[PDB]
Amino acid sequence: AHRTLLLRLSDSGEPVTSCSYGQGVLTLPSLPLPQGKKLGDMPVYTVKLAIPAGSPVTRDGLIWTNCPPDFSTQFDREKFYKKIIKTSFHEDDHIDLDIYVPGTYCFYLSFKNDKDELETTRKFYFVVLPILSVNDKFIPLNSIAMQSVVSKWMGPTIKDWEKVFARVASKKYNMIHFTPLQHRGESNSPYSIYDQLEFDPTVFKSEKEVADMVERLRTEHNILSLTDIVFNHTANNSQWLLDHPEAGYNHKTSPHLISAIELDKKLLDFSEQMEALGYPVDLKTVDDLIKVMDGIKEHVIGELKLWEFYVVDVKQTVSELREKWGNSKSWSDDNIPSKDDSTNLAQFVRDNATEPGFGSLGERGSNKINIDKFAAILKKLHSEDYNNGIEELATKILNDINLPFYKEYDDDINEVLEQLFNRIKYLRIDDHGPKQGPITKKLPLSEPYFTRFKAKDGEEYALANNGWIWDGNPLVDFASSQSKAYLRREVIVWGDCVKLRYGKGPSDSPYLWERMSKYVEMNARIFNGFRIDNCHSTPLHVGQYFLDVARRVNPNLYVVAQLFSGSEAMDCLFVERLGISSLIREAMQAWSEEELSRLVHRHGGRPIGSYKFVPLDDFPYPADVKIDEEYCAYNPDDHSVKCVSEIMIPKTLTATPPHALFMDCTHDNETPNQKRTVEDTLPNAALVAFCSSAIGSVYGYDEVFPQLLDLVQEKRTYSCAENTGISKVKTLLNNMREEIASEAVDIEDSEMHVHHDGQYITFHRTNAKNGKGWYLVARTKFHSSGDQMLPRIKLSQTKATFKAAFSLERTGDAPISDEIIEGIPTKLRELTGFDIGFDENTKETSILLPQDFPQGSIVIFETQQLGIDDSLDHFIRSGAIKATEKLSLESINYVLYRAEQEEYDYSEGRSGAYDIPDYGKPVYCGLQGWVSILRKIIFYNDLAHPLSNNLRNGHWAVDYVVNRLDLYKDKEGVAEVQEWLRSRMERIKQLPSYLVPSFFALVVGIMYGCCRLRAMQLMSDNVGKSTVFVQSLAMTSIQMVSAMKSTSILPDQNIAAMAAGLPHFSTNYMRCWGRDVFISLRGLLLTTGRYEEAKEHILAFAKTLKHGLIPNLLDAGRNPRYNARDAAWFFVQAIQDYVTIVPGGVSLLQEKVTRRFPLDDEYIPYDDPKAFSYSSTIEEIIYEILNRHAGGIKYREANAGPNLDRVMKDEGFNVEVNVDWETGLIHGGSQFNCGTWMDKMGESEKANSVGVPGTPRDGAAVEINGLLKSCLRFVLQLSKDGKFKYTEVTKPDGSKISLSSWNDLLQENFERCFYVPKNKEDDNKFEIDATIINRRGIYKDLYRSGKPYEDYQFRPNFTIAMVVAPELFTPDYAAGAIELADQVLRGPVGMRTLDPSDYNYRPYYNNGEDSDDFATSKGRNYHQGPEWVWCYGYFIRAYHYFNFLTNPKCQVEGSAKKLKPSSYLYRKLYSRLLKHREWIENSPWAGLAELTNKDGEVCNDSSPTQAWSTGCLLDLFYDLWISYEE
Ligand SMILES: OC[C@H]1O[C@H](O[C@H]2[C@H](O)[C@@H](O)[C@@H](O[C@H]3[C@H](O)[C@@H](O)[C@@H](O[C@H]4[C@H](O)[C@@H](O)[C@@H](O[C@H]5[C@H](O)[C@@H](O)[C@@H](O)O[C@@H]5CO)O[C@@H]4CO)O[C@@H]3CO)O[C@@H]2CO)[C@H](O)[C@@H](O)[C@@H]1O
Ligand SMILES: OC[C@H]1O[C@H](O[C@H]2[C@H](O)[C@@H](O)[C@@H](O[C@H]3[C@H](O)[C@@H](O)[C@@H](O[C@H]4[C@H](O)[C@@H](O)[C@@H](O[C@H]5[C@H](O)[C@@H](O)[C@@H](O)O[C@@H]5CO)O[C@@H]4CO)O[C@@H]3CO)O[C@@H]2CO)[C@H](O)[C@@H](O)[C@@H]1O
Ligand SMILES: OC[C@H]1O[C@H](O[C@H]2[C@H](O)[C@@H](O)[C@@H](O[C@H]3[C@H](O)[C@@H](O)[C@@H](O[C@H]4[C@H](O)[C@@H](O)[C@@H](O)O[C@@H]4CO)O[C@@H]3CO)O[C@@H]2CO)[C@H](O)[C@@H](O)[C@@H]1O
Ligand SMILES: OC[C@H]1O[C@H](O[C@H]2[C@H](O)[C@@H](O)[C@@H](O[C@H]3[C@H](O)[C@@H](O)[C@@H](O)O[C@@H]3CO)O[C@@H]2CO)[C@H](O)[C@@H](O)[C@@H]1O
């Protein structure tokens, strides 16, 4: 059953995090395998990659990964495997990587540049954890309890070990970590290994004997077993080092050390003969150690000769100049700085006349001049004859060259001295650690830094032995030639053990890499896992290759690291690549009480009432995605990784931080006896145990041992003394955690609260699904620090239960035995007097501690939050699908959207939108409003948000959500949605205040997704199966199309009517504009499948016609206004678009409507007998337009004067349109008029612009005539098929033209009248004036308008003509124009309404301005540089069409040897839509704006969601879809 999760990639192929859980790693769920299935029967998991559509990374895209294809193909980390990415511009690709076996896995993408070179992404790793299991018992990785045992304090039979096993076993540890149990070195450290291939002889003969022992623990005590593995060193005494001295760092491999080796041999040479000189045998004073210090300087620094290791031997160089003088002739070049530049020159000699390896460390005297090249320089520079003070001048240069080399040697040797001051004064004088043993064979001053021996190959050698460095970047091998640590004495040295030089790979040390392979394999097949000692100082590549080896031998290997690299950032990288399962943490490192309350809070779990992830509005809802109809898919034995909802988007795969294994105390930790008090052994151990994480403990901690046990010098066995110290209490803690084990799986599940108060720590450990808590009061004994009274503890809507209490008390001191290691004497006495008090009216629990509660104590309560059971979880995640089942694309508006005024309109003034205290109102009353706010909130777990606050401050939002819908209750399927939301909301309100933010988020998020999946399902497939960006655009339809009370499109009914934009054009006499509806209709209604709707709109506006054209503003068709020339044509174009797209849509034409105005252009009878009086087929309405225009229109706007328009001058009101029969084109309007969409009628007083419009667009508007062309074309093509029945047009004289002629008329005259050619000579043919011009290569915005130059302005309107009727345009001419637009008119999200070069380019729309600026005052600007967004939609459609005809490299050989666009062109289209993708992600409303200000700046007056802004971008998608997608 279902075991997939979904890893969204970005545009750059980077993974996408679903939640901020902070610096993490992509680890997959630690579940067991589904019931029955063994490893390799099936994918363990499957990571779905989801690549976004049209992203750069999909251009010759490819996904490379090293997950093997099948269960048989071994993993090799280097072998990759290809997967082709399917490009769509609409449709995101998805690629499944099946994982068959656990480990670590990367993938990258290869793809093609915009240089057409081949680029790679980084690698992106992800981990699959082992299934730890003991019998038929799955051990989740948070129920590990690991007891570190040291092999050599368990006594000499495997029998006496089985007792130590029994004792841990009874405290219910399930994992034992052994420190290595191999043949030990000479020092007898378990970390100093004599032979990694053989197990300790004292105990085991064979490996069988150890594997069988470990297999006892498994069956005998239910215990899994780790080993320490040691990668960085073997022991001084190993006699494979005789046989392979190359494995370490010596004269041959690491030659830089040659200086450091000589220093070391000449320091144990000293302590020998130091006896015969000065008085430093044994000392106790800083001013008779300074006596040894100068004794050093003389006999060892001095005796290795001013350090020929750094510096040039000037005396040698010079006298070999005198002998080889006269040999490299001269130096011919000009490259020598004059002798005056003492420095510049010496730097020149360094570069040009030195032997390779200059400025190195290595050999005794290996920093050499090229004598002969030097001579040359000197000859050229000074004199050919040596005897003109060359000997001199050569020494000067040579010395200047040695100046940084000598300061290098001095910096180095001061740091040698100070390092030897501070480790003879630590090793031989008490500071923190006295150890005053004077000199020996085996106790000199200098720690042996190198191990010294004659090899089997006969030669002497000296391998560097390993250590650590106080404040060093740990990732930088200090034995490498990068660092001088062995020479500078910066190493803290385990003379015990020898450092192992792995290489770049096995080539550099091949014998080594084989032993370590033989070693790692051997342990891997015995043990369930490893503990990697000192991981951060083991080069990644080494760690990776050897863990891979093991994990080949044992797929379910468990790996635990001691790892502090520099950053969390790094520790993630190591975990990533090595497949580390667990990072180790130490409680004993906490200095104070607070330092511990903090550690505990890192490894606690998430806040109480933390937000829960849902997919919201940044996902694609495939119309065809699975549904889990009442959340019943997941079957408990199948171990299915579950989706959040009914709708089956998978569980996202996000970075979570690496898994922690918290040690109450490690085997390198000073004991609570030492660092605090034995009494703290309890509360410290409980605190840790109460974390949500694995835990462990060293043997003896629970047993209350006194001193940390020295790994080397210790001799004895562990006591057989059963049930000592804390045993009873771990048994309880471990058995308790086991009960919890089953339940909490994922990071979101176990929440918590931690509180430090003085010496008390308080740890609430909740489960977030079901409400079970555990509460712990731990009173620490950091010190014996007196009497403190913790205050009345208060829980909310919670119940409490005493579970246990204890106090650890010191009975006296530790016994003292030569051959047995024992505990401190300790009582563990049970406690009482804890007063639990539940207030039946607050529902508050108060907890009072008795005064008998000595530091060193615990009380555990079990808790249970009130209002949560197992039941809740499911009920919240179900039936949201069946609620929405009755929704329409109208009714979805009501549930989701509804701008505030849209909601005052339904509620006659009293309802509106919810004011969140200290935030303000959301934007839609409906769910979108909330989702827009919640999303960032869920992402950041912001429980501080004003919404988060108000949501527990009370339940008012909860109820607002369910009560809004009273208004829209009768609308289809809203009722049922509301009732889903009431039931879930009702139930939520039975929760503790503090859980209501979390659950309200989820309850909304769920119904929002259901609601949105329901939208894609009812819309067309082209929308249904596309990208987010597109659905997002598509939904904007559902914002705009809803029914009202104050308005409609039919006048007797109120139905679904399309608004121009929210919230400025949504209500009363202002929602519908003929212009806006019909520019939108294709995008929002047709592209999307809402054909039935489109029809209702077309027919509803049809009714309105008069003056042979269609009205601007439509009062649901009753007293509309005809100040609009634009409209009729945009209308007719939609009629075409409909007949084209709708199946059998031709039949629209025969559809009758009530004409609700008479056939002459008679005055307004609103509701006479003369309204529903006579009818009209859409057929004879199209005709009606063409014919009326043909024969001239002329009219004084019905009902003129201040009333119908407050600003229109008297002159303007009466309007004209007349067809110039010389060209066939429509001229009209006047200089006091705005028939076009660029219709600001200037209003300001102080700037003097009243009744004087800013963009009259009289005469031949470009769009209008392009639209006329389209219309003629279409009706002709229709005449041809019986559907239109007209060729008829009477002209204002009486004469009659074939519609077919009119078509042929424009077809020749249009481009002529409108084009402005690039070449000044072609002007003849194209009708113009040179001095009244701006640019060229334009198609002008107007022909013969009221003012000369307003024709010749570059403006984004011609693009409309180019889309609707491209036959008018000679390809190459248009492609040049549309390309200038792209560099000049195209803003980042909208199209500049005027050429920036122009004198009256003022690109900031400020509709408030009361100024004396004729341009800017009261928004005259609107259409003069402001960047409109529907304009981009025409621009981009057009830009694609003509780059696909015109340009060769925009095309390619498609399906069926016919042409389709190339990746190159899509790339350019995609790029010009990124700022729209982003705009819509980050609008608080779904959509794109009306209108932007100069270069993308947000225009505060712009309606922030416009209808046509997205309708026109939907068009483009539909083109690419219909045009090329089969
Ligand atoms: O110049 C370098 C160094 O030398 C001199 O300091 C000496 C110290 O004063 C001396 O005590 C000795 O350190 C002891 C130490 O007393 C003892 O506690 C234990 O060391 C602890 C460290 O105290 C502790 O910080 C921790 O170290 C971490 C380290 O912080 C972490 O970043 C990472 O690198 O891992 C380290 C541990 O692996 O744990 C260690 C024990 O593991 O043992 C030490 C050795 O006996 O060290 C110096 C003499 O050798 C200079 O005076 C001083 O400027 C510098 O500290
Ligand atoms: O009872 C019916 C109704 O009749 C009369 O209405 C008339 C208007 O009062 C009258 O001014 C005229 O309207 C024209 C207007 O002159 C013209 O400028 C244009 O309107 C533009 C705005 O100028 C423009 O700024 C923009 O306004 C947005 C603004 O960007 C936004 O920030 C926010 O403030 O909202 C505004 C929209 O509400 O866009 C509009 C329209 O696109 O076009 C108008 C008509 O074409 O003609 C009206 C005809 O009915 C009465 O005066 C009125 O009181 C009565 O209710
Ligand atoms: O051959 C006899 C040698 O005697 C001397 O060496 C001593 C050192 O001076 C001590 O410092 C000590 O080193 C221990 C170390 O104290 C202990 O913590 C442990 O460290 C592990 C550690 O647990 C692990 O996390 C990782 O860091 O690896 C370490 C293993 O190195 O073990 C250290 C080594 O035993 O003991 C040594 C050995 O007695 C003297 O300096 C030598 O020159 C001399 O040869
Ligand atoms: O001061 C306002 C100014 O506006 C009107 O002139 C217009 C020009 O006709 C128009 O072409 C444009 O001028 C550009 C030139 O044509 C072009 O050759 C090049 O030189 O750049 C000019 C930059 O504007 O500018 C204005 C419209 O904004 C009006 O007719 C003038 O009388 C009036 O003085």
- Looking at the CA of residue 1401, tell me the nearest atom of ligand 4: 28
How many other β-carbons are positioned within 10 Å of the β-carbon of residue 939?
A: 16
**Judging by DSSP bridges, how do beta strands 835-839 and 1391-1392 pair with one another?**
unpaired
How many Å apart are CA 593 and CA 684, to the nearest integer?
A: 10
How many Å apart are CA 1231 and CA 783, to the nearest integer?
A: 92
- In angstroms, what is the span from residue 1207 Cα to ligand 2's centroid? 10
**What's the token pair of residue 464?**
């560097």
The answer to whether 309 touches 320, Cβ cutoff 8 Å, is no
How many Å apart are CA 1365 and CA 1225, to the nearest integer?
A: 14
**What's the token pair of residue 974?**
């809203």
By what method was this entry solved? X-ray
**DSSP, res 1082:** I
> Burial, 281: exposed, middle or buried (Cβ in 10 Å; 0-12, 13-18, 19+)?
exposed
How many Å apart are CA 1159 and CA 1176, to the nearest integer?
A: 10
Tracing tokens 């340009």 back to the chain, one arrives at: 1447
| Region for residue 552 given its phi and psi (left: phi exceeds 0; alpha: psi -120 to 50; beta: otherwise) | alpha
Q: Among the options 536, 667, 756, 1440, which is catalytic? A: 536
Q: What is the CA radius of gyration of the chain?
A: 43
The answer to whether 571 touches 658, Cβ cutoff 8 Å, is yes
How many Å apart are CA 728 and CA 709, to the nearest integer?
A: 23
User: Which residue in 171, 192, 808 sits closest to 500, CA to CA?
Assistant: 192
**DSSP, res 774:** E
- In angstroms, what is the span from residue 263 Cα to ligand 3's centroid? 22
Collect all residues with Cβ–Cβ distance below 8 Å to 1503 and sequence separation of at least 6.
1060, 1061, 1062, 1063, 1064, 1065, 1489, 1490, 1491
- In angstroms, what is the span from residue 496 Cα to ligand 3's centroid? 5
Q: Residue 365: CB within 6 Å of ligand 3?
A: no
How many Å apart are CA 936 and CA 930, to the nearest integer?
A: 11
Tracing tokens 């303007």 back to the chain, one arrives at: 1212
**DSSP, res 1281:** T
DSSP 1401-1432: ------TT--SS-TTTGGGGGGGSS-EESHHH
> Bridge partners of 804?
860
Is residue 756 part of the annotated active site? The answer reads no
Nearest-10 Cα torsion for 110, 113, 115, 118: 0
Q: What does the angle CA 546 – CA 550 – CA 553 come to, to the nearest 5 degrees?
A: 145
How many Å apart are CA 1358 and CA 1365, to the nearest integer?
A: 11
How many Å apart are CA 76 and CA 66, to the nearest integer?
A: 7
How many Å apart are CA 1511 and CA 771, to the nearest integer?
A: 49
DSSP 1436-1447: HHHHHHHHHHH-
Q: Among the options 412, 533, 1137, 1395, which is catalytic? A: 533
The answer to whether 802 touches 834, Cβ cutoff 8 Å, is yes
The answer to whether 1401 touches 1423, Cβ cutoff 8 Å, is no
The answer to whether 1472 touches 1437, Cβ cutoff 8 Å, is no
How many Å apart are CA 1341 and CA 1331, to the nearest integer?
A: 17
How many Å apart are CA 429 and CA 1279, to the nearest integer?
A: 112
Type and span of the H or E element at 860: strand 857-865
Nearest-10 Cα torsion for 686, 690, 694, 700: 0
Return the half-sphere exposure (C-beta side, CA atoms, 13 A cut-off) of residue 1330: 7
Q: Edge-to-edge strand order for the sheet containing 1491-1492?
A: 1391-1392, 1427-1428, 1491-1492
Q: What does the angle CA 1204 – CA 1209 – CA 1214 come to, to the nearest 5 degrees?
A: 70
How many Å apart are CA 194 and CA 498, to the nearest integer?
A: 11
DSSP 111-145: EE-SSS-EEE---EEEEE----BSSS-B--TTS-E
What's the gap between Cα 192 and its chain centre? Answer: 44
The answer to whether 1450 touches 1379, Cβ cutoff 8 Å, is no
How many Å apart are CA 1491 and CA 1487, to the nearest integer?
A: 12
DSSP SS3 for 871: helix
**What's the token pair of residue 1416?**
């800017």
Collect all residues with Cβ–Cβ distance below 8 Å to 848 and sequence separation of at least 6.
792, 793, 834, 835, 837
> Burial, 1387: exposed, middle or buried (Cβ in 10 Å; 0-12, 13-18, 19+)?
buried
How many Å apart are CA 925 and CA 968, to the nearest integer?
A: 12
DSSP SS3 for 732: helix
DSSP 1329-1397: -SSS---SSPBPSEES-SSGGGGS---TTHHHHHHH-GGGS-HHHHHHHHHHHHHHTB-SSSEESS-TT
User: Which residue in 704, 702, 649 sits closest to 825, CA to CA?
Assistant: 704
Helix residue ranges per DSSP H, 1160-1261:
1178-1190, 1210-1213
Helix residue ranges per DSSP H, 886-945:
891-896, 900-906, 927-940
Q: Where are the beta strands (DSSP E) in 636-745?
A: 651-652, 660-663, 694-698, 717-718
The answer to whether 1310 touches 1269, Cβ cutoff 8 Å, is yes
| Region for residue 1116 given its phi and psi (left: phi exceeds 0; alpha: psi -120 to 50; beta: otherwise) | left
Collect all residues with Cβ–Cβ distance below 8 Å to 1444 and sequence separation of at least 6.
1450, 1451, 1459, 1461, 1465
Collect all residues with Cβ–Cβ distance below 8 Å to 754 and sequence separation of at least 6.
597, 600, 601, 604, 761, 762, 763, 764
Q: What does the angle CA 186 – CA 190 – CA 195 come to, to the nearest 5 degrees?
A: 60
The answer to whether 65 touches 23, Cβ cutoff 8 Å, is no
DSSP 355-407: -SSTT---STT---B-HHHHHHHHHHHT-SSTTTTHHHHHHHHHHHHHHHHHH
Q: Residue 495: CB within 6 Å of ligand 3?
A: yes
The answer to whether 1471 touches 59, Cβ cutoff 8 Å, is no
- In angstroms, what is the span from residue 103 Cα to ligand 2's centroid? 66
User: Which residue in 301, 362, 306 sits closest to 489, CA to CA?
Assistant: 301
How many other β-carbons are positioned within 10 Å of the β-carbon of residue 533?
A: 18
Tracing tokens 């049930």 back to the chain, one arrives at: 723
Instruction: Output the residue whose Cα is nearest ligand 4's atom 20.
Output: 1334
Q: What does the angle CA 1301 – CA 1185 – CA 1275 come to, to the nearest 5 degrees?
A: 50
User: Which residue in 801, 1006, 800 sits closest to 884, CA to CA?
Assistant: 1006
Instruction: Give the start-to-end residue ranges of the domains of the chain.
Output: 1-128, 306-418
Type and span of the H or E element at 548: helix 540-553
How many Å apart are CA 547 and CA 561, to the nearest integer?
A: 12
How many Å apart are CA 286 and CA 274, to the nearest integer?
A: 18
Tracing tokens 């390092």 back to the chain, one arrives at: 419
How many Å apart are CA 283 and CA 268, to the nearest integer?
A: 18
Collect all residues with Cβ–Cβ distance below 8 Å to 383 and sequence separation of at least 6.
390
Q: Ligand 4, residues 1349, 1393, 1397: which to mutate, most atoms within 8 A of Cβ?
A: 1349
How many Å apart are CA 551 and CA 101, to the nearest integer?
A: 10
Q: Residue 1396: CB within 6 Å of ligand 4?
A: no
Return the half-sphere exposure (C-beta side, CA atoms, 13 A cut-off) of residue 500: 29
Which ligand has the nearest atom to the CA of 532? 3
The answer to whether 856 touches 781, Cβ cutoff 8 Å, is yes
Q: Edge-to-edge strand order for the sheet containing 1225-1228?
A: 1193-1196, 1214-1220, 1225-1228
The answer to whether 1090 touches 890, Cβ cutoff 8 Å, is no
> Burial, 708: exposed, middle or buried (Cβ in 10 Å; 0-12, 13-18, 19+)?
buried
User: Which residue in 808, 861, 850 sits closest to 830, CA to CA?
Assistant: 808
Tracing tokens 């649901």 back to the chain, one arrives at: 1116
How many other β-carbons are positioned within 10 Å of the β-carbon of residue 1261?
A: 29
- In angstroms, what is the span from residue 1330 Cα to ligand 4's centroid? 13
**What's the token pair of residue 1502?**
């712009």
**DSSP, res 1251:** T
Q: Residue 1334: CB within 6 Å of ligand 4?
A: yes
DSSP SS3 for 331: coil
How many Å apart are CA 255 and CA 362, to the nearest integer?
A: 5
- Looking at the CA of residue 233, tell me the nearest atom of ligand 3: 31
**What's the token pair of residue 1000?**
């309200």
The reply to whether omega before 1063 is within 30° of 0 (cis) is yes
User: Which residue in 1281, 1306, 1197, 1176 sits closest to 1241, CA to CA?
Assistant: 1197
**Judging by DSSP bridges, how do beta strands 651-652 and 4-8 pair with one another?**
parallel
User: Which residue in 1111, 1107, 1266, 1268 sits closest to 1184, CA to CA?
Assistant: 1107
Note the CATH number of domain 1-128.
2.60.40
**What's the token pair of residue 645?**
């909802």
The answer to whether 1109 touches 1124, Cβ cutoff 8 Å, is yes
Type and span of the H or E element at 1227: strand 1225-1228
> Bridge partners of 1195?
1215
Q: Edge-to-edge strand order for the sheet containing 460-468?
A: 233-235, 492-499, 460-468, 450-454
- In angstroms, what is the span from residue 1196 Cα to ligand 2's centroid? 20
**What's the token pair of residue 192?**
């100093």
How many other β-carbons are positioned within 10 Å of the β-carbon of residue 721?
A: 14
The helix/strand count (H/E) of the chain reads as 41, 50
Is residue 536 part of the annotated active site? The answer reads yes
How many Å apart are CA 1220 and CA 1181, to the nearest integer?
A: 22
DSSP SS3 for 570: helix
**What's the token pair of residue 594?**
């607070």
DSSP 1301-1341: HHHHHHHHHHHHHHB--SSGGGGGGG---SSS---SSPBPS
Q: What does the angle CA 430 – CA 435 – CA 437 come to, to the nearest 5 degrees?
A: 125
Q: 1403-1427 b/e with 16+ CB inside 10 Å = b?
A: bebbbebeeebbbbbbbbbbbbbbb
How many Å apart are CA 717 and CA 151, to the nearest integer?
A: 10
**What's the token pair of residue 149?**
């045992």
DSSP 207-251: SHHHHHHHHHHHHHH--EEEEEE--SEEETT-TTTTT-GGGS--T
> How many residues belong to the chain?
1526
How many Å apart are CA 764 and CA 751, to the nearest integer?
A: 9
Q: What does the angle CA 658 – CA 664 – CA 669 come to, to the nearest 5 degrees?
A: 105
- In angstroms, what is the span from residue 189 Cα to ligand 3's centroid? 7
**What's the token pair of residue 654?**
């996000």
Is residue 533 part of the annotated active site? The answer reads yes
User: Is the torsion defined by CA of 1062, 1064, 1068, 1069 positive or negative?
Assistant: negative
Collect all residues with Cβ–Cβ distance below 8 Å to 824 and sequence separation of at least 6.
673, 678, 704, 705, 706, 725, 810, 811, 812, 813, 814
Q: Among the options 668, 852, 966, 1410, which is catalytic? A: 668
The answer to whether 707 touches 190, Cβ cutoff 8 Å, is no
Tracing tokens 């690629």 back to the chain, one arrives at: 95
**DSSP, res 508:** G
| Region for residue 323 given its phi and psi (left: phi exceeds 0; alpha: psi -120 to 50; beta: otherwise) | alpha
- Using a 6 Å CB cutoff, which residues line ligand 2? 1064, 1069, 1112-1113, 1121, 1123, 1205-1207, 1239-1241, 1407, 1419, 1422, 1501
> Burial, 633: exposed, middle or buried (Cβ in 10 Å; 0-12, 13-18, 19+)?
middle
End-to-end CA distance of the chain: 34
Q: φ, ψ for residue 70 (rounded to 5)?
A: -130, 175
DSSP 752-766: EEEEEETTEEEEEE-
How many Å apart are CA 25 and CA 128, to the nearest integer?
A: 11
**Judging by DSSP bridges, how do beta strands 1061-1062 and 1505-1506 pair with one another?**
antiparallel
**3-state per-residue secondary structure call for 419-439:** HHHHHHHHHCCCCCCCCCCCC
User: Which residue in 905, 1042, 881, 906 sits closest to 965, CA to CA?
Assistant: 906
How many Å apart are CA 315 and CA 308, to the nearest integer?
A: 12
User: Resolution, in Å, please?
Assistant: 3.3
**Judging by DSSP bridges, how do beta strands 793-795 and 844-848 pair with one another?**
antiparallel
How many Å apart are CA 657 and CA 608, to the nearest integer?
A: 19
